[PDB]
Design a binder for these strands. Structure first.
Lengths: 306, 335
RNA sequence: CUAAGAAAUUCACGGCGGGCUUGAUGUCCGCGUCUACCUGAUUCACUGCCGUAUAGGCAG
């Protein structure tokens, strides 16, 4: 959607038990819906007082550690779990496997509004960071950086540049600051054109199969593996409707009885972990929401990428 | 008619992190910022059978032939170095605040009544009995679980970390402060007032809890063990995996939180255990027994229904337990 | 307003028994490394005197 007037950088946030289960088909890094919902909660909690609109998040992931283990004699992995409390009779509860992962992400938030003028930049950057320190990012606590060498501060970069050279200069100054990670974007045009190529190969192909084809490592006869352009991960790129839209006080056991509920289902798209200096404009690579609620199709992506 | 909310969910206040354990020597605990981390390594064990025979395999031929085929395990082991007698266990604690506000509540009537009930509690008696006991379980190193049971001296240092630095620092003798008496102390009351001002306010209070335990040279430290189902085929199976964040042994954050919540001296059974952890249907995983059963009217659901729905406020002890569950978090709600 | 909200893996352990890795061997012919320079930028904050002085001044 709308272009960011400024670009706020939350620095390397340490998340201790984030949801490794992104979706029913994918594990690993949490979904970009987690980060877009976090930035909407930041807007909902501090942005309505600074008179700004925090919209769009760029995900960087400097460090990732999944609490997984590879069992003996097995090629695949399983999840290390937590020991829940007992039942009221003293027995062990039924184990529900959740994946936990220790992240270190830095978020680029699109900030636009009239509160950029009314307040200093470091003030609203400090306020969204002191509000983010009491929050959680994929189900995991944001570790608030006590007693290391120095605390990582913020920088709200005003994207309005007086010159294009100064704009490229401070895009470089921000990219150098969020460099040891890998920015996560959405490549759904690549998924569709790979589906088109797979359909010229074999007819009646689904883009679930094209997504899988971009996921695998295919061995080819003369032996060589089929190379890929980038990292090309599967991500859950939103939700698709299963039920019609139910009224607020009509569905049973909702979160609130003032919001319309609709049973949805994941929509697995394609992602691409690329380094942040391959984009040449950091005002791209920000993940927004796209609802279109009359059809279903509640989804997130990063438009204006290419 | 004020029915209960079908969705109730309280967030976790008192949110700790993974307790990083490192190692060095006592009487330079004040320079323990470059102490090397306790690393988790593998060692091989070979054991005989010691479990109970099942009255059909008690015959001497099968037993003697079963000690000739021993189980051979690779276990994870974390030890102090042979020139280090002190274990430094360090974590961070966020005391978030907004302790009675649920993260999810269906009924606006039940939500307003629960906020009215929590505010009636906080004005009548604030977070001063709860946070005193949370400050005790910080001050005595109960989060040192098996790392405390033979230590010559445990010493807990707690630093209120403000915007960039230590705003107020504490230092306790964790072995004088017992694991079963929630007494009074001036510095404990200051830490309790800080945890209270965190649990009351709209923002978080960040503490840095460091506990040094003088165990001995080269002795075993006991980090948290990982719940790994499906260890795999028995040949290369690692029978015990110890938790470590980044080549550095650690205690799980929920284990530290479980030690911090051990404030419940109010359960109706006799206190041969002393304090247990605050849980709905208060259930000790080591004892295998759930105190605060619903056959008595002393679990969290019956007390919260009586307090919020029909205004039968319990005693001050059971309402300490109720508000301690609201600080503890949980996903409540019927169908 | 984040596949949201919640969570103690843990108790114990003897891996050791024993051993000859040996023989044998051509690395080797050949070669243009030149060219041209400011270490000096206050770059030695010195030695001594009068003074009770560390306070302050003075000489070369």
């Amino acid at each position: 959607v709308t272009d960011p007037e400024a670009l706020l950088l939350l620095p390397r946030l340490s998340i201790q038990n984030a949801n490794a289960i992104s979706s029913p088909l994918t594990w690993g890094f949490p979904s970009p819906g987690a980060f877009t919902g976090f930035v909407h909660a930041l807007q909902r909690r501090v942005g309505i007082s600074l008179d700004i609109e925090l919209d769009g998040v760029g995900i960087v992931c400097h460090r990732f550690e999944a609490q997984i283990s590879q069992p003996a004699g097995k090629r695949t992995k399983v999840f290390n779990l937590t020991r829940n409390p007992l039942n009221r009779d003293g027995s062990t509860a039924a184990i529900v496997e959740e994946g936990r992962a220790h992240l270190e992400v830095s978020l680029l938030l699109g900030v636009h509004g009239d509160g950029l003028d009314d307040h200093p930049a470091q003030e609203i950057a400090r306020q969204v960071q002191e509000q983010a320190g009491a929050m959680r990012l994929a189900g995991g606590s944001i570790l608030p950086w006590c007693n290391e060498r120095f605390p990582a501060p913020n920088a709200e970069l005003l994207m309005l540049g007086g010159s294009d050279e100064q704009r490229r200069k401070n895009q470089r100054r921000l990219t150098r600051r969020l460099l040891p990670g890998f920015a996560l974007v959405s490549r759904e045009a690549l998924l569709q054109q790979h589906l088109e190529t797979l359909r010229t190969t074999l007819p009646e192909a689904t883009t679930l199969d094209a997504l899988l084809d971009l996921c695998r490592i295919n061995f080819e006869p003369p032996w060589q593996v089929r190379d890929k352009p980038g990292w090309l991960v599967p991500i859950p790129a939103g939700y698709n409707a299963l039920s019609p839209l139910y009224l607020p006080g009509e569905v049973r056991n909702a979160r609130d009885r003032e919001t319309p509920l609709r049973f949805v289902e994941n929509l697995f798209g394609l992602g691409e972990w690329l380094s942040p200096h391959r984009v040449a404009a950091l005002s791209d690579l920000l993940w927004y929401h796209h609802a279109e609620p009359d059809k279903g199709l509640y989804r997130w992506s990063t438009p204006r990428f290419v | 008619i004020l029915s209960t909310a079908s969705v109730l969910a309280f967030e976790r206040k008192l949110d700790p992190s993974d307790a990083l354990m490192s190692a060095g020597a006592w009487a330079q605990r004040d320079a323990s910022q470059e102490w090397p981390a306790v690393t988790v390594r593998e060692k091989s064990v070979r054991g005989t059978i010691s479990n109970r025979l099942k009255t059909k395999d008690r015959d001497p031929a099968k037993l003697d032939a079963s000690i000739q085929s021993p189980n051979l395990q690779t276990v994870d082991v974390a030890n102090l170095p042979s020139d280090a007698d002190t274990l430094k266990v360090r974590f961070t604690l966020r005391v978030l605040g907004g302790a009675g506000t649920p993260s999810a509540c269906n009924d606006a009537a039940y939500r307003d009544k629960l906020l009215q009930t929590v505010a009636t509690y906080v004005n009548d008696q604030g977070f001063a009995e709860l946070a005193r006991r949370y400050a005790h379980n910080l001050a005595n190193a109960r989060f040192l679980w098996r790392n405390r049971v033979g230590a010559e001296a445990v010493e807990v240092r707690i630093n209120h970390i403000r915007q960039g630095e230590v705003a107020r620092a504490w230092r306790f003798d964790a072995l004088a402060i017992g694991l079963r008496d929630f007494k009074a102390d001036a510095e404990l009351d200051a830490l309790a007032e800080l945890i209270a001002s965190g649990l009351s306010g709209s923002g978080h209070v960040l503490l840095e809890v460091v506990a040094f335990a003088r165990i001995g040279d080269g002795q075993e430290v006991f980090p948290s063990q990982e719940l790994i189902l499906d260890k795999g085929d028995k040949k290369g199976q690692k029978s015990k995996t110890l938790y470590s964040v980044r080549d550095a042994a650690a205690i799980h954050s929920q284990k530290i939180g479980n030690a911090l919540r051990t404030i419940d001296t109010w359960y109706p059974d006799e206190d041969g255990l002393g304090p247990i952890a605050v849980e709905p249907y208060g259930s000790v995983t080591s004892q295998g027994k759930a105190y605060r059963q619903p056959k008595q009217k002393l679990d969290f659901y019956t007390l919260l229904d009586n307090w919020v729905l029909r205004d039968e406020a319990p005693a001050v002890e059971q309402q300490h337990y109720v508000i301690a569950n609201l600080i503890r978090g949980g996903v409540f709600g019927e169908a």
